[PDB]
Every structure is written in structure tokens, then in C-alpha cells.
Amino acid sequence: TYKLYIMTFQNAHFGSGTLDSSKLTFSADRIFSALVLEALKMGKLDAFLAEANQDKFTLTDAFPFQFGPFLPKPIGYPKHDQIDQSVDVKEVRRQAKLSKKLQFLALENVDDYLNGELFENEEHAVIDTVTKNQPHKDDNLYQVATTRFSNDTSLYVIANESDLLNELMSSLQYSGLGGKRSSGFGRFELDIQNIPLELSDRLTKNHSDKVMSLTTALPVDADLEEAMEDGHYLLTKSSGFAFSHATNENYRKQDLYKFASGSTFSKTFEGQIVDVRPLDFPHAVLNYAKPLFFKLE
RNA sequence: ACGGAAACCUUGAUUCUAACGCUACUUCUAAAUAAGCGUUA
Numbered sequence: 026t027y028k029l030y031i032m033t034f035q036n037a038h039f040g041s042g043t044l045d046s047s048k049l050t051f052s053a054d055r056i057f058s059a060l061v062l063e064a065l066k067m068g069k070l071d072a073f074l075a076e077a078n079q080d081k082f083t084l085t086d087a088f089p090f091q092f093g094p095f096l097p098k099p100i101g102y103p104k105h106d107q108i109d110q111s112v113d114v115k116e117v118r119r120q121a122k123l124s125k126k127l128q129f130l131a132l133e134n135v136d137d138y139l140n141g142e143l144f145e146n147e148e149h150a151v152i153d154t155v156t157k158n159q160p161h162k163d164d165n166l167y168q169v170a171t172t173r174f175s176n177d178t179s180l181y182v183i184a185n186e187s188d189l190l191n192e193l194m195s196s197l198q199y200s201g202l203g204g205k206r207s208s209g210f211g212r213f214e215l216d217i218q219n220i221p222l223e224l225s226d227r228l229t230k231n232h233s234d235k236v237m238s239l240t241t242a243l244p245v246d247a248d249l250e251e252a253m254e255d256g257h258y259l260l261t262k263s264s265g266f267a268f269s270h271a272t273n274e275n276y277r278k279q280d281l282y283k284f285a286s287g288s289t290f291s292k293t294f295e296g297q298i299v300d301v302r303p304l305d306f307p308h309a310v311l312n313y314a315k316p317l318f319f320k321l322e
Numbered sequence: 323a324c325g326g327a328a329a330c331c332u333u334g335a336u337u338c339u340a341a342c343g344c345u346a347c348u349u350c351u352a353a354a355u356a357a358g359c360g361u362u363a
Contacts, residue, residue: 040325058324160332265325
């Protein structure tokens with residue numbers, strides 16, 4: 026809610042379940058895990074844990090940044106109250122398909138999207154697959170997907186201004202983000218920018234109006250009811266193998282189903298640093314689900 | 323405590339074999355090392 030962190034990538038790989046799958050943008054649990062690993066490699070893991078335990082710490086999923094912050098399409102607002110038209114069915118289905126394909130909108134027109142206007146996606150990155158082999162066992166021919174960006178398009182997140190977070194981001198920018206980081210993917214250059222006046226006044230965390238989430242956040246059990254009755258959302262898995270320097274064998278962490286972005290709700294909630302570690306495991310596995318919200322008209 | 327870790331698009335291959343810058347064409351055609359002896363004595 027304080028800064029507007031920008032990460033300019035050249036090549037990246039954000040696996041969505043397979044080595045040959047790469048999403049355009051990553052989720053906040055991935056960057057929180059990356060921060061946790063960088064902090065533990067630094068040695069100042071306890072300070073970052075204490076900072077994350079505070080309610081001031083807020084993080085959001087990466088969104089596209091092309092001469093202005095972008096926001097995920099608010100799932101649950103194709104509402105006919107602003108899209109009531111007398112056009113033919115062909116144009117109605119064409120605009121429905123165009124809105125379904127849309128995933129990100131520029132900040133300057135997000136409310137315009139809520140006025141019935143129709144916008145198209147913009148060229149942000151090309152996702153291409155590369156085949157690689159192992160020239161000692163002539164059976165492995167594995168494919169890796171990338172997210173090669175273009176047109177000065179970066180990724181951005183919103184988080185509090187902290188010196189520990191600043192230095193952690195600076196160490197992240199030479200350590201990569203997601204995927205085969207020691208192969209030419211994930212690396213970025215960081216820039217710190219101020220939140221625009223048209224955006225900072227909308228980033229909220231505590232009130233009872235229509236809020237669109239910015240983080241893949243699973244609410245606490247106390248207030249899930251309000252997200253169930255009057256909440257529009259999408260369900261995203263967070264499975265995978267838990268990285269661990271303490272166990273020789275790789276353990277699958279517990280599959281957890283969160284709420285995607287931008288899921289719309291009628292009231293805000295509280296996130297969880299949920300322990301997705303398997304049983305009998307020495308150290309925790311922290312999954313970050315803490316929402317930053319956006320007010321709607 | 324990042325659907326993540328590890329992984330060479332790698333090994334072997336001669337732009338090589340055959341093929342006369344060759345066939346025909348006189349440095350040729352006429353031509354005396356030769357002509358004039360004045361005037362004075």
C-alpha cells in the first residue's frame with residue numbers, strides 16, 4: 026500500500042504445473058517464498074518472519090506494467106446494468122469472448138471497464154517453448170516454456186516501504202524468480218516508484234463495500250461466509266514440491282485452494298501464512314495468502 | 323520454505339567424382355644499291 030515495486034524481466038519461467046507451461050505473471054506466494062529463501066540464505070530469516078507476522082505487511086500478485094500499472098480483470102462484473110444494449114447476438118457474443126480473453130486492464134480505465142466499455146488485451150510477452158537434451162543419456166528431450174517480454178513491459182507489485190524488503194528485492198534481482206533460474210530465466214532489474222494518486226487512494230484493506238482482491242488470498246475461517254454468499258471468485262491450486270535443504274528426498278506439499286485475483290467481494294477479510302508443510306517435516310513451508318484490495322464504484 | 327531441483331539439441335558426415343581454353347590460319351604482296359659529268363683548261 027506504500028510503494029509500486031517494478032521488476033523488468035527479460036526471460037522468465039513461471040510453471041503452472043509442468044516444465045513446459047509458463048504463465049505471464051506469477052502469484053504472491055511465489056515471491057514470498059523467494060523472499061523467504063533469500064532471507065534464510067542471508068541469515069536474517071527471523072526479522073522477515075517478524076515483519077510478515079505484522080498486519081502492516083501487504084503483498085499482491087505481479088501485474089503487467091507498461092507505462093502504467095495494470096489490474097486483473099474483476100471476475101464477477103460482466104453485469105448487464107451497464108452492458109444493456111440492443112445490438113445483435115453476433116456482437117454480444119463477440120464482446121463476451123473479448124471480455125473473457127481479457128485478463129488485465131490499464132489503471133486509467135478500470136472504472137471505464139465497469140461502465141460497459143470493451144477493451145482488448147495488449148502485447149506484453151510471448152510464451153515460447155525450447156527443447157533441450159542431455160548428451161550422455163539419449164532419451165531425455167525436455168521442453169521448457171518461457172515468458173519473453175517485449176515493448177518495455179515489466180511486472181509490478183505493491184508492498185510496504187521497508188529497508189529489509191528493499192534489500193531483499195535487490196538480492197532477488199540477481200537471483201531470478203521462478204523456473205530454471207540457473208539456466209537463463211527469472212532474472213530482472215528492480216525499480217522503485219511512487220504509487221500514482223489515482224491508485225493509492227483506492228488501495229484499501231478494511232471496510233464493507235465492494236472490494237476486488239489483488240492477491241491470491243485465502244480468507245480466515247471466521248469470515249469465509251461473506252465471501253461465499255456475496256463473493257465472486259476463481260479457485261486456484263497451489264500444489265508442488267516443497268523445496269528443502271534438510272531432506273534428500275523431495276516431498277510434495279499440501280495442495281491448497283485459494284481465491285484468485287481479482288476476485289470481487291462485498292467486504293474485506295484477513296489472510297493466512299498457512300503452513301503447507303508435510304507431516305514429520307523439520308522446518309515449515311509458508312504459503313502466503315494475504316489480500317490487498319481495490320475499491321470499486 | 324519460488325510446479326520447484328538436477329539435464330549441451332548433442333554424437334558421426336570431404337560440396338566430392340569426370341572434363342586439354344581446344345579446332346583452322348604463310349608476317350604476306352610489287353621493288354637492279356642505283357642516277358646525273360656540266361663548264362673551263
